From a paper:
We showed by HPAEC-PAD and LC-FD-MS/MS that [name] is specific for blood group A tetrasaccharide type II ([name] II). As expected from the construct, [name] adopts a modular structure with 3 domains. Structural alignment to homologous GH98 enzymes identified the binding pocket and the general acid catalytic residue as Glu 411, which is present in a cleft in the centre of the Cd. Fragmentation of this species showed that the deoxy-hexose was linked to the hexose at the reducing end, as determined by the characteristic fragments at 431 and 449 Da. Together, the HPAEC-PAD and MS/MS analyses confirmed that BgAtri was released from mucin following [name] hydrolysis of the Galβ1-4GlcNAc glycosidic linkage in [name] II.
Numbering used by the authors: 49 to 892
The structure:
Amino acid sequence: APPLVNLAEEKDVKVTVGENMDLKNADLLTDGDKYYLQHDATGNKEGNNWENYQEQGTEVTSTAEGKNGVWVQVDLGASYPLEVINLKRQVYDGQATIGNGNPSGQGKRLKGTKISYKNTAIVIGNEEDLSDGQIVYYEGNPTLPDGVKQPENVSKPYEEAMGGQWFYMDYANKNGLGATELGTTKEARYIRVYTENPKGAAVKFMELGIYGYENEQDVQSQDGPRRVIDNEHPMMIATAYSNDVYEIGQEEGPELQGSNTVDGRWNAIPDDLKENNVLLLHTNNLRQFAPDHIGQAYLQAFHEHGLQIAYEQGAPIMLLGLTAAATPENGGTQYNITADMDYGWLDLMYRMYPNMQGVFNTANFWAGIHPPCEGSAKMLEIADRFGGFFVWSDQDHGSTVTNIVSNANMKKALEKHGDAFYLIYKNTSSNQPDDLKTSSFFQGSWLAGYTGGWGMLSDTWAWDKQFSKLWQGAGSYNNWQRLCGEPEALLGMQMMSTYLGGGVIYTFEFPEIVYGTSNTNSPANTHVLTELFRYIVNHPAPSKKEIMEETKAVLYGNVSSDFYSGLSGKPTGFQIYETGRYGIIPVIPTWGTRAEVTKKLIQEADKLGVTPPNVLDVKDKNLSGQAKQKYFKDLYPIEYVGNAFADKWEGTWYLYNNKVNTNEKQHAILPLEGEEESARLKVEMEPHEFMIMNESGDGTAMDITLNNYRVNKDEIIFDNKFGLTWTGDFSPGQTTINGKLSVYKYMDEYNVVNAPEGKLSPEDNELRTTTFELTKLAKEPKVQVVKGQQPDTDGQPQYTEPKVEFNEETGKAVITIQTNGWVDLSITGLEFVYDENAQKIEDE
Ligand SMILES: CC(=O)N[C@@H]1[C@@H](O)[C@H](O[C@@H]2O[C@H](CO)[C@H](O)[C@H](O[C@H]3O[C@H](CO)[C@H](O)[C@H](O)[C@H]3NC(C)=O)[C@H]2O[C@@H]2O[C@@H](C)[C@@H](O)[C@@H](O)[C@@H]2O)[C@@H](CO)O[C@H]1O
Ligand SMILES: CC(=O)N[C@@H]1[C@@H](O)[C@H](O[C@@H]2O[C@H](CO)[C@H](O)[C@H](O[C@H]3O[C@H](CO)[C@H](O)[C@H](O)[C@H]3NC(C)=O)[C@H]2O[C@@H]2O[C@@H](C)[C@@H](O)[C@@H](O)[C@@H]2O)[C@@H](CO)O[C@H]1O
Ligand SMILES: [Ca+2]
Ligand SMILES: [Mg+2]
């Protein structure tokens, strides 16, 4: 029970009207129903047809000749601090037709004649006759109570809307229509609404919501940001997709994909990671294509129910604000019930639910550009007003940011609210090599100060575009099979590369694979995401200052996808690098001209007390095919030798094998700390492995964490040994397509961490070799397993004990270990001696 309530619903209200007015169905004014849906139990269809919009409400009819104006008054029974009023009257003159929307033949929109009421006013006070009345809203010339002055500024009529109209307690803020700071209240017992129907003596009041507090003590206040998102406070987002089943009034919380629940997903998060996690409520295909009355009812009911369950658990929430250009803005689609968003309702969710933090936008521009920018500009302002945030997820082929800023309203909203705005990549279209350019754009936007930060959405749909079985191409498998195919450790490699670039947001799909089903944690979540995210929570990423200090070159403009080849790495579609030598290579998109972006970057650098990096156009002669390698190699000295990825950040080495689906060993030769500069570690790894190494500093010891967790899908998914149905079709009496049910069944029965009787432990028992060669040493060093991933219930080990071989002649120690999972090693008793033959750390 949060402190802001609908007092009109909560209290035993009394409804009255004036002299020469008749009142019918007073109870409907405060019943919490704006839509009067009748077929919730059958998906809001009568047979195969969406239910018609039937407007019910409190009818007030003037019986005075020559005076069609009426009023209705609610007595809350006592005085309460009021913050928001929601007024809805009959929207349509006659009936709405369920008409064609966008796309044609699929999307439904109401069409008909909307009413523009006139002589509307809202007056509140503590006297039953409102002799002490305070004007909340005033349009036209309705006669106010004796003692109440006319306002100097009077409003003009508006068109009645599906969600009603929203009023606040500051008459100076757009004549009462302007959203106030949290906790802006006026005390009142009595709320009177004047209205004249342009046609006739009767007004139908569908709903009057009166939001306020039990007492002054409960009144809320804006107390800085709801969340900090930065290197010291990173954020993991998990998508909570509706399973597309919901009935207004249901007692149980909204069902999510894969038998998950909002509270169940929250309680699955390890306690020490909960403060760095959020849940994203996603309407998915819930009431997809529905006309306005059904779409808005379900968008609100689904999100409110989720928010309430999250509030009880202390779980912070983001809502999906916009996908597939499904916005109420002119030209929007109805691909999602986000098409029925009421900005006044979104404002109310921030006031009502202190755990409401953010809005998410993804995958719009395929379906339209300007309408989703118009919507995003409004929702970014709302989020920032309440100290919340806005996350935009997309891959940038070159036009994504340019499109965002091509919209005048979105450009202006970013100028004012940019610190609450975050861009994260989205590698779904892994076959288009824009992964590395997107990271550059999003890092550059943050670095120059256009945005609050950047991060990642790694999507296992990326596997589907290229690969199936381990080491193999996509072949002719069903896409739902290929979705299950991605190596778990590869998600950690992506998380490590985003971390090293000062990324602060981490998200993964498909959620039922990467996070889990049935309110359990998946193998990916248990053995990779929670393990590395804990590291990232406890070891801050580079700050903006730390990235700016280490950045020698910032690029401007539409960088070529393949620019990264010969520098940081060939774009794979999987958001990983061949080397950390050059970092991400920030590229500022066309937020402004090159000169404008340069002034912005210099001001940002100056605020941080750092030398501004040089800004080069992507077309600069230094950045040509033939010149870029010498140019970058001269700016950034080599830190290690080899074809594996390595980067040294804050005295720690970060490595991985960078082969996505080719079985090749790679190595990194690292110059080691301590008095003996000739000291070397050669690490050699097979694919799907990342490593964190932290030297004692004096040359005697090092700690190494490696993680190469990988489940084998070849037999259970691709050979389909359990005969799952992998198709995009529905079976009779199912609301979910067979391929998706097959993903859930795989995660529920065949791929279970700590598998109970009758379920299968993960196929993760085939081990792979890591070797460490240390030169040149006086004697054999000591290696031990400080801690290692333990068996599943099948009792099979995830690692073997490390073996050490020391050649006393060459002074080379070789440490060998076999793993599938994580191990923490400690190497001690190192005595390095001068090695005239040590690998030189220099370019070829
Ligand atoms: C032109 C183009 O291709 N546009 C891109 C879309 O195709 C992307 O949509 C996703 O496509 C997936 C296949 O690659 C898949 O169909 C997915 O829907 C299915 O999976 C999601 C989870 O990822 C949900 O479980 C859905 O319910 C499920 N569909 C069904 C019918 O069961 C698509 O993604 C969803 O739809 C888009 C529009 C967004 O709302 C996403 O957040 C959804 O998850 C799209 C996503 O990256 O990118 C476009 O550019
Ligand atoms: C008595 C007898 O012959 N024992 C058998 C073992 O030798 C088998 O182990 C595999 O042997 C292969 C050579 O004959 C090979 O070394 C293989 O490891 C290599 O391939 C795996 C494939 O994933 C990994 O890539 C390893 O990293 C790679 N090794 C190197 C040095 O690059 C061996 O399999 C591994 O080692 C065994 C002991 C187990 O730990 C497996 O989980 C590992 O994959 C063994 C399996 O075929 O069968 C015995 O009967
Ligand atoms: Ca195992
Ligand atoms: Mg009602």
